[PDB]
């Protein structure tokens, strides 16, 4: 089952990465950032430029070649919307263990076709599309997140919102807790990784001592996560979970940027998600600026800070 | 994206979906001739506006109602003269109403049975789902709350396509019997293939009905389109009717900007849909009212930033501007350059609170520090919200 690929989310210092769309504007800039961060970016693909050299690294026409020649176990996609679904499929077919798709704007119907293939295999784990990526601070950065705000630590972060991911990271760096692993699952309605996927990794990871879950209006993934936490994160040794759900004041019936962010037919509202998470013991920060302080205090109440 | 009734019904008809035979008219005389050319026992005349409630609307010509039935083509023309060129206002338009430039003239058909039939991309089901109920003519949300056992669904495999067995089963669950069942199943199939062809997120028919004469007809329908597929749906998006949209939102769209106007007085200039929603939330939390939602997307060009900022400075209600950028793919320096360029021409008679963090934040702060502009700096999101609310209180 595709759930067997969940472990591939936990990138580390040994993860070698290729960049699909390597020579494009954003693929170039964020590849530069990844190299400066110390990430083992070893090459990239751009159909028609195989054999060339870019940022001092080899360029390949296909993922299959790039994987065989470089030993990469992860790929990140900076391919424009008309072709990005095909780029994801190429990475799945090449059995890349982890694929991160940054691209915003892939047709929903395209992603339905990608998900169809994705769910019928388990060599490849997809994060995204329309997401910032995944980062293991100080070990492996795959995506667009600003490197300098991270600090290796104890909080696992999963968020549908890229920018709110950065807020959670910054706040948990500020209060000294740091981050174990940070996954932006993106704002699209059809994607490769949901809250439960990341929550499984977090609850089983000893380095993750607390969790921040950031959601928003639309869908029912937060409600599913609430039930998952009810059954797997109750009792004595539970890990504190803090959450913020964006859109409490959003107008109904409007797509709020993310196509996945809409209140339609009375479903997808923020208050229902907040209540579901609260019923599971999650502490919901009403302010998005207080995620760090809220989880710090939950660590304090449980005497989890060794001052 | 929005399509007039006559545009969507044409799209459905051109793809095999049975709708009421109809013509569209720009003049009362065209309405009269269309009525006579129909050669129909009874006729329906329908004002073409996007908002709902056309039936209970009122024109500034005195005519009550945007939908009229009659057997006489002469009445169709008499009524159309009071519609074309006039403003139709309903319970869902501004008080000034919407100018009606076109009317539909369609064959009126008796409805012996109403059902609900829709096709949508279902997030929970990871693909297209047929949704149907024999209880037609009412909001499906009500049927779901009153009689969930009457909501029937079929999950369609995106590669296999809809199977006859699925179309037949849904047709039966909707109460279609005998030859009407084969008719309904064929229409369900054509609706599904249309849904895929046009990159719809939803095609909703209500009522999906029978006539006394034994025809299955899509009497009314709403199509929601996937904006991400515009690049491969140029012909359909060309038909987009922006005449009833909020005007600032229309301007933003010209530059690929996602702007949603609100009722407050604190403008918001943010990157990311989540941070943008969260900024509205935190302003409310701290005693303010946001004037808009605004999501500056991924790779911003200075020109887009410049135009986006001007969209905030030209809303009469705006009494303060909150800039909150946490840049990853968004380059903070591009934001700074666009804002300062806009402020050089504006005048800026309102407080400007600026929170910048992330990609290239140092260069960005330098630009703002060299600008000579009256900027209130904020260190974090709560600080920015408190300073914004205080600046207009
Ligand atoms: C956090 C949410 N995400 C976002 O905000 C991301 C928003 N931005 C986007 O979605 C943008 O479309 C992307 C960042 C994906 C791309 O934008 P960008 O400005 O970098 O596009 P470019 O046109 O410069 O570069 C795309 C490259 O992909 C290449 N490419 C096209 N198809 C493929 C493919 N199948 N495999 C690999 N590379 C490909 C193109 O050749 C181009 O490279 P080139 O200029 O060397 O020929
Ligand atoms: O990296 C940036 O600058 C934007 C991040 C983003 O798009 O986030 P969100 O829209 O998913 O909330
Ligand atoms: Mg975004």
């Amino acid at each position: 089952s595709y759930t067997a690929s969940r472990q591939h989310l936990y990138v580390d210092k040994n993860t070698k990465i290729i960049c699909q769309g390597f020579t494009g504007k954003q693929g170039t800039f964020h590849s530069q950032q990844a190299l400066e961060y110390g990430t083992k970016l070893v090459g990239g693909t751009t159909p028609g430029k195989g054999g060339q050299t870019h940022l001092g690294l080899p360029v390949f026409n296909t993922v299959k070649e790039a994987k065989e020649q470089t030993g990469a176990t992860a790929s990140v996609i900076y391919v424009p919307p008309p072709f990005a679904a095909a780029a994801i499929n190429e990475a799945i077919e090449a059995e890349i263990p982890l694929v991160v798709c940054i691209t915003q704007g892939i047709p929903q119907q395209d992603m339905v076709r990608v998900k169809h293939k994705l769910l019928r295999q388990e060599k490849t784990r997809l994060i995204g599309p329309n997401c910032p990526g995944v980062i293991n601070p100080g070990e492996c950065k795959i995506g667009i997140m600003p490197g300098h705000i991270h600090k290796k630590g104890r909080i696992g972060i999963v968020s549908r919102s890229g920018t709110l991911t950065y807020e959670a990271v910054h706040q948990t760096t500020q209060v000294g807790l740091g981050q174990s692993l940070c996954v932006g699952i993106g704002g699209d309605p059809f994607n490769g990784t949901d809250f439960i996927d990341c929550l499984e990794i977090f609850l089983n990871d000893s380095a993750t001592e607390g969790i921040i879950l950031i959601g928003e209006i639309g869908g029912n993934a937060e409600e599913n996560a609430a039930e998952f936490l009810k059954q797997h994160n109750s009792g004595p040794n539970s890990k504190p979970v803090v959450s913020f759900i964006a859109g409490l004041t959003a107008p109904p019936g409007r797509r709020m940027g993310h196509a996945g962010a809409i209140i339609a037919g009375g479903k997808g509202g923020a208050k229902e998600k907040i209540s579901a998470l609260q019923s599971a013991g999650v502490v919901v920060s009403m302010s998005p600026a207080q995620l760090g302080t809220t989880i710090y205090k939950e660590f304090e109440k449980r005497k989890m800070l060794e001052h | 994206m929005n399509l007039q009734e006559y545009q969507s019904k044409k799209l459905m008809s051109d793809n095999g979906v049975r709708v009421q035979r109809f013509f569209v008219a720009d003049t009362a005389n065209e309405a009269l001739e269309a009525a006579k050319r129909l050669n129909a026992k009874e006729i329906v005349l329908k004002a073409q506006i996007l908002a709902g409630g056309r039936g209970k609307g009122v024109f500034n010509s005195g005519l009550k109602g945007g939908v009229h039935l009659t057997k006489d083509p002469n009445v169709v023309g008499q009524l159309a003269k009071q519609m074309i060129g006039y403003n139709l206002a309903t319970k869902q338009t501004p008080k000034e109403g919407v100018k009606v430039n076109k009317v539909m003239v369609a064959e009126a058909l008796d409805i012996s049975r109403e059902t609900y039939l829709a096709i949508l991309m279902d997030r929970s089901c990871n693909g297209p789902v047929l949704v149907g109920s024999p209880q037609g003519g009412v909001d499906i949300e009500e049927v779901a709350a009153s009689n969930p056992e009457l909501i029937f669904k079929e999950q369609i495999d995106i590669f296999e396509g809809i199977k006859d067995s699925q179309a037949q089963r849904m047709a039966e669950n909707l109460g279609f019997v005998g030859p009407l069942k084969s008719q309904a199943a064929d229409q369900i199939t054509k609706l599904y293939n249309l849904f895929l062809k046009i990159d719809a997120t939803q095609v909703e028919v209500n009522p999906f009905g029978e006539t006394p004469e034994g025809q299955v007809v899509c009497f009314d329908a709403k199509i929601n389109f996937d904006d991400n597929a515009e690049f491969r749906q140029k012909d359909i998006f060309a038909m987009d009717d922006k005449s009833e949209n909020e005007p600032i939102e229309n301007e933003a769209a010209k530059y690929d900007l996602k702007y949603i106007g609100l009722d407050g007085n604190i403008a918001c200039f943010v990157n990311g849909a989540g941070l943008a929603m969260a900024t509205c939330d935190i302003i409310f939390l701290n005693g303010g009212k946001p004037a808009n939602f605004l999501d500056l997307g991924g790779g911003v060009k200075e020109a887009q930033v410049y135009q986006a900022f001007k969209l905030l400075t030209a809303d009469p209600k705006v009494e303060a501007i909150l800039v909150n950028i946490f840049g990853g793919i968004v380059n903070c320096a591009i934001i700074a350059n666009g804002i300062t360029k806009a402020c050089r021409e504006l005048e800026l008679k309102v407080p400007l609170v600026v929170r910048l963090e992330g990609t290239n934040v140092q260069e960005a702060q330098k630009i703002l520090n060299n600008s000579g502009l009256p900027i209130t700096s904020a260190i974090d999101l709560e600080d920015a919200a408190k300073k914004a609310v205080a600046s207009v209180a």
Side-chain angles (χ1 to χ4, degrees):
Chain A
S1 157
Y2 173 66
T3 56
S5 71
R6 283 174 178 166
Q7 187 56 246
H8 305 182
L9 295 168
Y10 215 132
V11 297
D12 64 18
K13 59 175 76 177
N14 303 318
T15 300
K16 297 184 184 177
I17 295 90
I18 52 171
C19 185
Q20 297 173 251
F22 188 30
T23 52
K25 180 183 184 171
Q26 295 303 339
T28 297
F29 180 92
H30 294 278
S31 287
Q32 291 179 297
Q33 297 304 121
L35 291 167
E36 294 176 16
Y37 193 82
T39 295
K40 293 180 179 58
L41 176 62
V42 296
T45 64
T46 298
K49 298 191 175 183
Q52 298 183 10
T53 310
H54 182 63
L55 302 179
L57 297 163
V59 180
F60 303 85
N61 284 319
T62 72
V63 172
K64 183 191 166 68
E65 297 167 341
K67 188 182 188 297
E68 291 170 350
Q69 183 62 23
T70 73
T73 56
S75 187
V76 59
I77 294 174
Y78 292 87
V79 172
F83 314 112
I88 298 173
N89 283 337
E90 186 186 4
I92 296 171
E93 188 58 29
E95 305 185 358
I96 294 281
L98 177 71
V99 176
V100 174
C101 190
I102 306 298
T103 306
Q104 188 173 262
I106 303 179
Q108 289 191 28
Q109 193 184 137
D110 282 4
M111 283 308 308
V112 170
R113 302 176 183 277
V114 171
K115 194 74 169 293
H116 189 284
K117 184 178 175 61
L118 186 77
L119 292 172
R120 287 160 176 78
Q121 59 81 60
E122 59 192 67
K123 301 293 189 182
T124 297
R125 162 60 48 163
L126 168 66
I127 307 177
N130 191 17
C131 80
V134 54
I135 182 171
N136 183 337
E139 294 201 38
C140 183
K141 174 174 105 92
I142 309 180
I144 57 173
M145 62 286 290
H148 68 264
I149 56 165
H150 299 78
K151 170 251 170 195
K152 184 64 181 180
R154 315 155 68 175
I155 306 304
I157 304 168
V158 58
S159 174
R160 286 171 63 195
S161 162
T163 40
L164 290 173
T165 305
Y166 314 155
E167 277 292 349
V169 164
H170 193 233
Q171 296 171 29
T172 51
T173 288
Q174 282 175 329
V175 299
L177 296 172
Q179 310 84 40
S180 52
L181 183 69
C182 182
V183 181
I185 56 174
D188 272 7
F190 300 97
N191 61 41
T193 295
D194 60 12
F195 290 117
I196 283 166
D197 291 324
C198 297
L199 288 176
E200 173 86 2
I201 300 301
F202 292 161
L203 293 171
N204 296 335
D205 171 38
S206 59
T208 299
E209 306 179 46
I211 297 165
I212 288 175
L213 185 153
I214 299 164
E216 59 190 50
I217 58 172
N220 66 353
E222 291 85 353
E223 289 89 337
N224 294 336
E227 281 296 333
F228 185 90
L229 295 170
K230 266 188 207 295
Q231 309 301 130
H232 293 52
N233 192 43
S234 289
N237 301 326
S238 70
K239 295 185 187 191
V241 182
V242 175
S243 173
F244 172 78
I245 304 299
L248 195 67
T249 69
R254 303 307 309 271
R255 289 193 295 270
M256 309 299 297
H258 292 157
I262 178 152
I263 303 176
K267 302 300 177 189
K271 187 63 180 176
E272 295 98 330
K273 299 171 182 296
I274 292 174
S275 294
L277 291 163
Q278 287 169 328
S279 80
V282 180
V283 172
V284 177
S285 183
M286 278 301 176
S287 166
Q290 304 302 334
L291 290 164
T293 56
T294 297
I295 198 154
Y296 181 98
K297 295 177 181 184
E298 292 303 314
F299 274 49
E300 183 70 9
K301 289 158 65 176
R302 302 184 63 160
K303 297 182 177 180
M304 293 175 62
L305 308 168
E306 180 71 18
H307 299 305
Chain B
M1 206 211 104
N2 297 100
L3 287 184
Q4 298 284 354
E5 175 177 27
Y6 79 93
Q7 298 175 300
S8 56
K9 282 201 166 81
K10 166 170 175 51
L11 185 59
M12 302 171 73
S13 184
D14 292 335
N15 284 270
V17 181
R18 187 171 308 107
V19 301
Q20 297 162 260
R21 299 164 49 244
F22 77 100
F23 306 92
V24 56
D26 303 310
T27 71
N29 187 74
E30 287 181 357
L32 166 60
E33 298 170 343
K36 298 189 292 191
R37 172 174 36 188
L38 276 171
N39 191 35
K41 284 181 287 299
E42 191 155 20
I43 311 172
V44 60
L45 172 66
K46 296 206 250 190
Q48 296 302 280
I49 66 172
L50 308 173
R54 305 179 299 172
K56 307 186 191 300
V58 182
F59 297 78
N60 61 344
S61 60
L63 180 59
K64 293 182 181 177
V67 177
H68 293 275
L69 294 163
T70 178
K71 308 170 189 177
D72 187 1
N74 295 321
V75 177
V76 172
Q78 294 158 16
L79 292 173
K81 190 176 184 181
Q82 310 174 249
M83 296 187 175
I84 296 287
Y86 293 137
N87 285 16
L88 172 58
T90 76
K91 304 176 186 183
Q92 299 170 36
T93 78
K95 186 185 180 183
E96 184 175 339
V98 182
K99 184 175 183 183
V100 176
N101 302 282
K102 301 176 181 296
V103 299
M104 172 181 297
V105 178
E107 179 166 43
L109 299 175
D110 295 330
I111 316 183
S112 58
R113 218 170 52 86
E114 291 182 329
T115 71
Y116 174 98
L117 180 77
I119 299 136
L120 65 148
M121 290 302 187
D122 187 306
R123 308 164 70 152
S124 299
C125 296
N126 285 320
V129 174
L130 308 184
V131 177
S133 175
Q135 268 206 7
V138 286
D139 281 8
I140 197 62
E141 297 85 20
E142 299 167 358
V143 184
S146 298
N147 300 309
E149 76 285 357
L150 302 186
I151 305 301
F152 303 86
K153 299 187 182 175
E154 298 286 332
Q155 298 183 37
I156 308 306
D157 186 285
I158 190 68
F159 291 113
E160 185 185 43
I162 186 171
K163 297 179 292 182
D164 280 339
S165 63
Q166 298 171 304
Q168 302 283 348
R169 171 161 58 248
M170 182 63 78
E172 190 168 357
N173 287 333
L174 298 182
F176 292 93
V177 177
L180 290 163
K181 176 174 180 177
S182 184
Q183 246 192 98
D186 177 68
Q187 285 294 292
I188 288 166
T189 293
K190 293 174 179 300
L191 282 162
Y192 174 81
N193 290 329
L194 167 70
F195 161 95
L196 286 182
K197 172 177 178 177
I198 66 190
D199 275 289
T201 63
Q202 182 175 76
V203 174
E204 183 181 62
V205 179
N206 188 12
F208 184 58
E210 314 180 12
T211 68
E213 297 76 33
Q215 274 207 126
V216 182
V217 174
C218 302
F219 284 93
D220 292 303
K222 300 176 174 183
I223 304 178
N224 297 133
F225 294 90
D226 176 12
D227 292 333
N228 285 1
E230 180 169 2
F231 71 84
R232 69 189 185 195
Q233 299 288 354
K234 181 179 182 180
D235 287 351
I236 285 173
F237 278 77
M239 295 190 298
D240 186 7
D241 187 318
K242 311 176 185 293
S243 59
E244 306 186 29
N245 296 335
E246 198 264 307
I248 301 178
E249 183 171 342
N250 270 335
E251 194 74 29
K254 298 179 182 169
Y255 322 103
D256 298 338
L257 296 163
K258 322 183 195 178
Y259 175 100
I260 298 180
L262 308 174
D263 292 331
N265 64 346
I266 302 174
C268 291
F269 199 75
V270 186
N271 68 316
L275 188 60
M277 277 179 281
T279 299
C280 295
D281 297 337
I282 199 174
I283 288 166
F284 266 117
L285 284 179
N286 283 281
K289 288 179 64 57
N292 69 274
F293 161 99
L294 187 154
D295 172 17
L296 303 174
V300 290
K301 308 249 195 66
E302 177 186 298
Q304 283 174 310
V305 174
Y306 162 83
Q307 293 291 342
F309 196 84
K310 289 177 66 171
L311 294 175
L312 312 178
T313 68
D315 176 2
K317 293 183 181 174
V318 168
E319 301 175 52
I321 296 163
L322 171 60
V323 173
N324 182 40
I325 306 292
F326 209 138
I329 188 169
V330 167
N331 182 335
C332 284
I334 295 177
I335 299 297
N337 287 334
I339 290 170
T340 62
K341 176 175 175 183
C343 288
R344 292 199 284 278
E345 63 176 65
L346 285 162
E347 264 170 312
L348 197 60
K349 310 175 190 180
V350 304
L352 175 59
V353 184
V354 176
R355 191 287 193 99
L356 294 179
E357 185 59 75
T359 295
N360 207 18
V361 60
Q362 279 195 352
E363 177 189 359
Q365 293 172 321
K366 187 190 310 310
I367 296 161
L368 293 183
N369 280 346
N370 278 332
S371 69
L373 296 168
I375 292 169
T376 302
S377 69
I379 67 178
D380 70 69
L381 184 46
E382 198 99 41
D383 188 42
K386 284 175 178 169
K387 287 175 171 172
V389 173
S391 75
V392 294

